[model samples]
Target: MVPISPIETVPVKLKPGMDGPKVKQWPLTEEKIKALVEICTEMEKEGKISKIGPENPYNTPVFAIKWRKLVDFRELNKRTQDFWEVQLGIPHPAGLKKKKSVTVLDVGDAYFSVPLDEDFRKYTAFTIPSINNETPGIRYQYNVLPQGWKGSPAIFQSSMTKILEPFAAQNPDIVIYQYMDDLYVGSDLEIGQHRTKIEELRQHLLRWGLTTPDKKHQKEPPFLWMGYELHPDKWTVQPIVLPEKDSWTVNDIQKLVGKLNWASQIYPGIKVRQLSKLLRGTKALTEVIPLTEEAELELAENREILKEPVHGVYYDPSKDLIAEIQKQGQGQWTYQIYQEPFKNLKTGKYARMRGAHTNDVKQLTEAVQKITTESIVIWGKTPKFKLPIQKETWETWWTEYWQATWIPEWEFVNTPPLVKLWYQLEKEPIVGAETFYVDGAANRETKLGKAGYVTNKGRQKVVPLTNTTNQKTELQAIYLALQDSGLEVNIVTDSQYALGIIQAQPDKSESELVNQIIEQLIKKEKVYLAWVPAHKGIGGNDKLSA
Candidate 1:
């Protein structure tokens, strides 16, 4: 699992000579200490190497350091405070101080663009203040950035929450948390009731020196802001996708290069300069033979001209616009650049033009849809028994076993422990005429596709239900089997949510088909459930049944 980012930590400074001391031996292994030192050193480098933003306290400090080595602490602090307030929207934490004791603070962490320079070019951007006040001012230092800053995300989250606190209190109907600006305000009165509530909250925010979302509206499934799509159950954003068509002009190349460069972290399929050259309509030198080394050398040179922060910033403009890559050779400095915003005819949201792709909108849409909708139930219940009831039990002496019966000549006493166990368990013939097995078998033998196996132990009727894989479909099969019988028989599934549907007391709304499945299951005596680990150890009935 991708480790969840830590939001907080306690810093401890040990005495220099405390090596091997009792305190030093307090579960702080040598490896851990080394890692800690490495982390600190790495952070030092990030603060010094990675770019800082106007919202970072280091903004002034970094700028000052660039001008000279020394910087004013007071000035840096002031800028840091301003960075948090201006670039970010962190407000002084108030009112909700009381709510902290009872409520878990869910700080929203988000990223937004900060004008690196008033000119908005010739400078780099950072996700620091975009998420938190990490630009250097928070710690009163002057450096680039550190990769080992474990609390960066959480710190970023806290800053965003603090910034939105005041506006949040005044707008109870509209809840704002973390980095997102849109609030959930609902009104169930009469006609135009919800609209009235929204307007009231909006006006109140304006009075408090805040503004509503640049784009605001309600939707059925979720609402989107920046690149992120938000819903009660999930949050995701469409990634920026670059167009693959050839670029013949500066504008064509620049636009694709820009979007892919910024949001490339989300989609790094297309490298930058390669794109720019493609747009330039010339076989840029990077495309030469011996491609590997040439590509690296070219990227190294181009990384100076390009600024790619997290993947690329996704831009979807409401309409297509004329684009161009303008280069100015002003004797002293020669600058080449391209600009254009993606137009989302569907949403009318325009990302400010920069280096990015036109197809980003389409690519991001595909990515977001792919990620958020894919899901698994994680928990559920299955029926007690299967179908095709057995009539009676018979003698169990197996000729292969040492039960006063014949045995294989190869080895009687050398049978594996598991084989013996299986022989013993088979004596437990089915109690009822019908029996079922919740089993699955991967068609790894033939990678043509995946398949599964379901068996009826009582009637010895084994059917291979292949093609249809995945937990949800398997559960549906069992429930459908019950429905097909039309005997008002109890049906059970492995997912709690699936059972919830079958039981008809779901936590969330269900589809009409699922609702019908639930009704069928409930017609029986009951749907008993249990939590069982998968495979049930190696030999597991699945392999034997298959």
Candidate 2:
């Protein structure tokens, strides 16, 4: 039997000339009110409501209401440690050049299997309003941990960590990487040993009341775990593609950049310059920006590189002669023919022909006919030679004769100079420098542009000719600033077109704005031209663009 308490009721005041039944039918009456109080009393007894207040702190009512359980469910959502952090003392996944195998175990309904801690049960209570206003609402608190409660994630994480710890301790040779419900077992052990360990893991998980789905339980050499694509035969990362849209907001672009940044961690080949254009206007996804053709192409190039594959290759130097023979003509032709005499670099040995061959197709047809009678000789040894495999005893001799002999040879070998000069320029400091921001646009009607530079001295603006193109405008803005500034100044341009022009030699016809920059470079001690992304909350770029 649960404790039940009737809620205190405020008497209803009827309007002049209104009857009790009329009041009950419209707003409130003592009898109907009493009926709701009864339901509230039952809800309180059920532990749904404590002392008749709102369950959630956010809920506001004209009078006292149930208080919802205060649980921080967000606490449960946690980021998994890096591959190296969790698998400390082990070779990085990318660094593993040799072939390896892995077994994956994905726990089913992982969160639900984790029983809620008894101490946290009080914070998981919730309230339910009555089906109709005729009666009061009933509330009930959860006995077990419930989903969507604030503390559910933290409780679940702690419980799962404890469950997996013992297995990790027992398996010293096997590496276990656990990310919440996803578990991976990796090892360089033999296939039989690896399978045996996986079985042990399966049994352990079963005994612990955690179930792994059959579909997700499997052995693989190449597998997709977390966001990384891991394999013994190859190393690669999963590709990212942008979502199609009419217009994008700030948050939309931000989500795209965030993925790119993460992908770059595994795939270092992802260059920032490729996606710099799309990253420029990511300050406000709330602000609508049409998906322009320029923006589309910029994103497409990034996707192309992100999708590219990295292959793994294996080579052995000891078998370079056999390896060389294998590199030639296809099929048996390569092995059957003595294509040429080859020298092995490491052994300093030469592989030479041992027998003669005419234009007889039948003679060259079989590997044993013309090619098996071959010889290899290593130089730089006390003159020692060995006979071909043809041997005789009593009257019987071997048919297949492949032999190798060696003799020391003294010769001069030329080596290239190993010493070379290489230097990297240090990044220059930006102290006491004037910073200029420039942008330009062009249309059939008019070409508009401006160059704005901020300095402790003051902010200056440069607006140029109406007939000038955007490319010319961008170049002209820099030219104007260079003429006005002193020794050290930084010119920040968002236009890639202008950047390309300045990087290369200016054509004879493209000398007007180009020459001005050249002249300024000669005058100033140092002038730094920097390319910064625009409209991405970069203080300098955003301030000037706005």
Candidate 3:
């Protein structure tokens, strides 16, 4: 299962005999209180929270939680996970790329498997209010890492890695992987090698106070690892059996995607992109849509495909064949190669080597050169042949399998070049009449409109709006207030969206309102636009909010 995001949960007590850290209690300061207020205000503006009273709808009372570190430990641990996964080079669970059989094991009470390494125990100081309900108001902090601490998993995982180091260094043929308490041992060599590795691991763990209960260990194929059931005999990796139900929702699909996305890394044929669509507009806890017939059919089809062996290999065409295909391109530079179909041993179904597309022949050639050496088995016999990298789709399953999972950077363009140009324009000096305040909210039910001026003795008004978005409401409100005002006035608002729409080159829907605002600006000597943190006890904004 994909682990839940780490939370700074306050546990009732530590494991017996475990000592917590011995550091001073964390103190709250004025800057921290202000930051917390800022965070709450931001969240409320983003619709995550609502203020209490009608006149002061944006203001929210802040609550003080117990003293604890507020860092995003879950994200920190995930980064650690990414680092360890790459460093370990753990193979696909199904052992398709693996040269030999593998065994998987798990440690009991994983966080408490071994004592916290002495070097890092200083980081786990946490205060306890009472002991056994007797020492009321007597607080004691921890000297050892506690079970529910933010970085406990990473710390435990690191400790396990050190314990396994001796075995890993001495027995290169034997592969050992430890994710916190979950342990795996595998060897491509004979059965003796596997046994020796397991023995060494068991002995070392026992010495270090980390023990695996006899029942939790699996030594054969079809064992589970990180959600995929690795069955080397069937040469397949399948999703772990989820509790079957009569109906499934978008939330169900989202959770399935998380596990399946990771599993798809090892099994090339599974189409995870099909499931990704279900995540859009998903509710935090509930399903947005029921599972559909197409999704069910897709799942079943992938399950069937997993049973067959798929292999990717390089192609080296002779000079004559290359010359012949090169001539077919007629100077456009293209080539084609044939891949034979094979019969499935279990299902007696025929599997074909499909074609894929690529923009560059050189890239296709390079990708083909890196295909694995492992033989593809069909009908209990090895198929010895090289298939052409198909040019029908830009990426084949083989190429995608070889590439790194996450992109190094995220770069996307959503608007036109002119919009980007206007967004970067120099700011004009501010000159205007009495200032006024503006804000708006919207949901699926209504075509809610968008916001106006900031200064002392501010005036407020609600103009009728037509069928447009909440952004339209905010922009139109600003236009209505500034258009007829004879006095030079500055405008104050909280919606960044409204400001962005005003600043950027206007689209068709926004053109009328934006034009009016520009005309009013030209009439006034200097009008300034200012943004304030809404719902954080600003008196002028409180009066204008509705």
Best by TM-score: 2
Once superposed on the true structure, which residue ranges of model 3 sit more than 4 Å away at CA? 1-90, 94-139, 188-197, 203-220, 232-235, 239-546
Q: Rate residue 169 of model 2 by lDDT.
A: 91
C-alpha RMSD by candidate, in order: 25.6, 25.0, 23.4
Q: How close is candidate 2 to the true structure, as a TM-score?
A: 0.38
Q: In candidate 2, what are the lDDT values of residues 381-495, reduced to their tens digit?
A: 1211111111231012112112222212212112221111111111363677876665554444655544545544567764545676667766776776777787777777777
Please give, for residues 1-546, the per-residue lDDT of candidate 3 as tens digits.
433322122223333454433233234454544455455455446433333322211111122355222422232222221222233444433223334666677774544434443433333322222223353222212333444445455555665666678778988887676654567676677788676677777776666555567774645665555444555433333444444567666677777766554444334434544455566554666645665666676567556645554432222122111110121111121212222223111111111112221222333233233221221221112222222323222233224333433211112222211111111111442443566666554443666443334446545666544466666666666676567455455667776766665443232232666666555655665556667786787656533323
Query: Under the 3 Å rule for N, CA and C atoms, how many clashes does model 3 have?
Result: 29
Q: Cα lDDT of all candidates, in order?
A: 0.31, 0.46, 0.44
> Per-prediction TM-score, please?
0.20, 0.38, 0.36
Point out the higher-scoring one by TM-score: 1 or 2.
Answer: 2
Task: Return the lDDT, model 2, position 269.
Answer: 32
Using lDDT as the yardstick, the better of models 2 and 3 is 2
Model 2 lDDT on a 0 to 1 scale: 0.46
Decoy 1 TM-score against native: 0.20
Tens-digit per-residue lDDT, 1-546, candidate 1 = 433322222222223432211111112233443443344356456433333344431122212111122222332222221212232432211101111011112111122211111221111122111112223322222232112222233334453455457656765644444433334443223436545655564554344234445443433434454454433323333455434333234455455456545443222222454434344445453343222454444444445333342211222223222211111111011111111333210110112123212122122222222222221110011111111111111123233223242211111222111111111212233333233334333354342222222334331222455454444444544554444443322222234444333232321123444545445545643333322344546221244324
